[PDB]
Amino acid sequence: MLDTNMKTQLKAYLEKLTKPVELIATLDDSAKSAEIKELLAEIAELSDKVTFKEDNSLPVRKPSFLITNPGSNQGPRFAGSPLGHEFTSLVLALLWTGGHPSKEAQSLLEQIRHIDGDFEFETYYSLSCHNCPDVVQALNLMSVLNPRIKHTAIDGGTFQNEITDRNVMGVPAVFVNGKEFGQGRMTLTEIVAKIDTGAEKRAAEELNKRDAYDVLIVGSGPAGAAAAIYSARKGIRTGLMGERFGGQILDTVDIENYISVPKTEGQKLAGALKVHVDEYDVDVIDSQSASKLIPAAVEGGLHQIETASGAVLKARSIIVATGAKWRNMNVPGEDQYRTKGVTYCPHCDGPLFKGKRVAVIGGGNSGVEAAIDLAGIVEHVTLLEFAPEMKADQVLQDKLRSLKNVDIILNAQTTEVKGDGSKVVGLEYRDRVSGDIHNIELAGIFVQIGLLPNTNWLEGAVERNRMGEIIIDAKCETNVKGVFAAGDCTTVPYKQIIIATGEGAKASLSAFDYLIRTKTA
Amino acid sequence: MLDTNMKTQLKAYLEKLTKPVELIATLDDSAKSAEIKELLAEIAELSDKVTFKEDNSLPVRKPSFLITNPGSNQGPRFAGSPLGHEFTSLVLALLWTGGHPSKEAQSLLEQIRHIDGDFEFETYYSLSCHNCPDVVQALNLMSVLNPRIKHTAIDGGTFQNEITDRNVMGVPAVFVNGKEFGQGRMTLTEIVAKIDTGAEKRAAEELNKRDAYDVLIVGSGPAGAAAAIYSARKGIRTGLMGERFGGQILDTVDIENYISVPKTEGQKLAGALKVHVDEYDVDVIDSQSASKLIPAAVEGGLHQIETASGAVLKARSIIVATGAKWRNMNVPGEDQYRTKGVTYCPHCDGPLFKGKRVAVIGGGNSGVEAAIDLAGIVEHVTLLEFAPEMKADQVLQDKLRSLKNVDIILNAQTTEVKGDGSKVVGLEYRDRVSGDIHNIELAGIFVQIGLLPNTNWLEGAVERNRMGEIIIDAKCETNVKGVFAAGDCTTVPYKQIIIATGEGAKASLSAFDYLIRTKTA
């Protein structure tokens, strides 16, 4: 029941068919079936691409027909008349099956193809209905895009039995796997929204779709945060990736040497840093770990960062600010009395133990210097050295032995940190030689065993010194063009917040100068 | 009228005389005069050092006598009986004249000697008076210490005429140069306090009396302030000398890139810095200028700083943080529109001119980079170069010429900054070749002519690069052992507050390590 206008329009659209289409009907002896049979034969006459076949054995509605390709069973099924306002739905279904492209967003299309489970759709419409087409067309497009999705468009006029049995009052009305799905002017996008039930392991996939950065900062402590702020103020595309925004200052309490701020808290300062970063256009990526650096193969190319999560980020320039881990005694009492007698920084907490007795753990330059420093502030210092001798420079060793409020203990290994429920009161150690245990009364324990820069993931890529520190010049340049580094992970002689932030700022401006000089050529 | 006990005590005290004393009396024929004459002859009998002379011509009180040395007229004069409670005053006056030392503080003594004007003292006492001696003795000691001070101690019992005429109701009562001076238990110190009327040019003299410092920081901007804080926390003797606490941040307003602080003011930040410095034991010296560095002649010796005011400070270690001056256009309108369109920092104020038109002054690397930077943020940039060509690197020159919102003007000299009463609206410049004047409409003027590190006063002492920047290594060490430098005055590639403060911190810890290694040996 096509008129001359419909037939001519179909001649035109079916010329855009690049693949053969087949129309497989399943029919009874009713007038409705004769109407569909006449229709399909008329559509087959308008193109040598379209073919009308019949199979009245199949267990489907009668009349109905499948729009598919030769040697296939994938495609949309019309049940009843696909004419009226559904005529464009019919035409579109032929084109799509025929290899003509969809007008939908390309991303949305791939989401249909890569879909998890089986869904059997069926929509109830009428020929008079104005809204039904968009729904039918949308679902039709899904069945064409992947065979796991099936769709059968029911004409209510033909199948009055179903719309009256299956209690639908309005059209369009959609069903899935038996269950009711929804009604009304559904878009394609919102149907794909309800159908996809996916959660985890998506973050990595979100990161590969990410565009290349002008600068990508790896690590989000004070150094990375400062670099991010200085970078985003130049208006360049700035990404700040880290494991845990805040870095080492998150697990500290009282900070009294961030210049211009007599006393703040670690958590508060980490929060302030975030606020300041968020003032500018900075793509902040949290809970991710750089696992590898792949340096660019050409000047003016892109460095790449691989994540433990499987993603790969890319950038014109990189700033490594991954900081360090400060080595622990690894003994009972240690964790419980951190910020509360157990400390890892003589520069930070030294002033707090005036008149108190303390221990330093470690007999290297760090430890021995620390003891000498503290010895001028505190009542008494005891240095515990694991080995039979201190590794520190001889000048420092001599200086420490010439102090009247200092005990050196060699072959000493800490076994326990002792407190009173809220604060340190003493220390337990083992003589490694005799095996004996001894106790020391004290208020503070300064752990100076060593620093482990978080840089082993860069082995081979950028040059490091013999301590794992990333080697840098005054401009924070590494041996790799367009890779910079800032803060504790680098060769900076001292490890502090105010120092780290300055370096972060330095590395940002050095990265920016690098970009200026590499964009034109 | 000495008894046996007085005479024997005098034999003993007059043996401590190292210089000859003379007692010159001026007498009449009264009983009082015979009493004094008998006294002086009895005192002369008790020592071959003491001599009794008489001169009744002199125009002084009668009886009275001067305690002096041969061939001199300097000394205290007693008028009437120096016996009773004034006997120790008499003895003390002889000892002092005789070369026996004072029991007074040595500093206080030199203050008497080095005193400005002429003062003629005279004290009224009685023999019964308990308090009078300390006053008399004090003033006596002054007349002995310098001849410009004169003192005459009047016995009220002998000279009833004066205490009744000159209306004194109580003793002791002191007079100066005719005028009344004061009464009661005056100390020496409080008399010297009222007598000295000195004000200016004392600060320099206060600085030489100052003890040597562990570390002396020269310059009191962000860098010096941070160094001072880090130093004073180690508990060492820390001095912070500068011309004007606050440095360059005092003459700025909005600061938005001090990390962890989204927006502060220069004056506020300078104040915060002061508060933080004052939390620790830091000798802050303001309004002074280092004019010269004299490096120590030995390892473990002392560096010295000379001031323009004439003082010399000394220290085991030095940190130079004198910053820089940012060169001006030197034109009308410039001063008036600073912080208000005229700026000297692309990193600081670049973000403020989104959508605005700006000029950069200077065609060196700083200027050209600045233009390239701003060109990405602002509507339009115009670079004015004084010379016929830009000095900048060719890569940068090419990059700037390849930008669509940029004008380069050569042979251009700024003549006027134009505003509307509160903000910049344009610029006036001269073509150096044709002499013509031209106007440019704009909102911002970024002056990038050059930096002048405040370091010329160090020529010869510490090595500088070809830009006047103090050369330093990652530890902020100069070529002179125990001299460090931090901030804009050094070779740090970038000049910013957060950068400067980090360096200040670095230099402090490097200075401290230097001290540890130089004290024992």
Ligand SMILES: Cc1cc2nc3c(=O)[nH]c(=O)nc-3n(C[C@H](O)[C@H](O)[C@H](O)COP(=O)(O)OP(=O)(O)OC[C@H]3O[C@@H](n4cnc5c(N)ncnc54)[C@H](O)[C@@H]3O)c2cc1C
């Ligand atoms: C308990 C404690 C108290 C302290 N108190 C003070 C104090 O009072 N004053 C002071 O000045 N200093 C103090 N410090 C030192 C100060 O915290 C550090 O010097 C400073 O935080 C270093 O900044 P940073 O950004 O260079 O490194 P970090 O702070 O260590 O930050 C580096 C960040 O990068 C992340 N990261 C590491 N590896 C990767 C990777 N592969 N991929 C992605 N991200 C990664 C880390 O998880 C971390 O979040 C203290 C340190 C500790 C441990």
Ligand SMILES: Cc1cc2nc3c(=O)[nH]c(=O)nc-3n(C[C@H](O)[C@H](O)[C@H](O)COP(=O)(O)OP(=O)(O)OC[C@H]3O[C@@H](n4cnc5c(N)ncnc54)[C@H](O)[C@@H]3O)c2cc1C
């Ligand atoms: C107008 C303006 C705005 C700025 N805005 C910003 C901003 O928003 N953000 C930012 O990060 N940076 C900004 N800066 C830069 C920043 O102020 C400097 O980088 C920083 O102040 C340098 O610190 P400094 O201690 O090393 O030097 P300075 O700040 O210059 O301090 C050095 C001090 O030493 C004194 N001194 C000099 N010679 C002697 C001597 N012979 N004896 C004794 N004392 C001496 C000086 O008078 C001064 O007080 C701005 C600069 C200017 C000029």
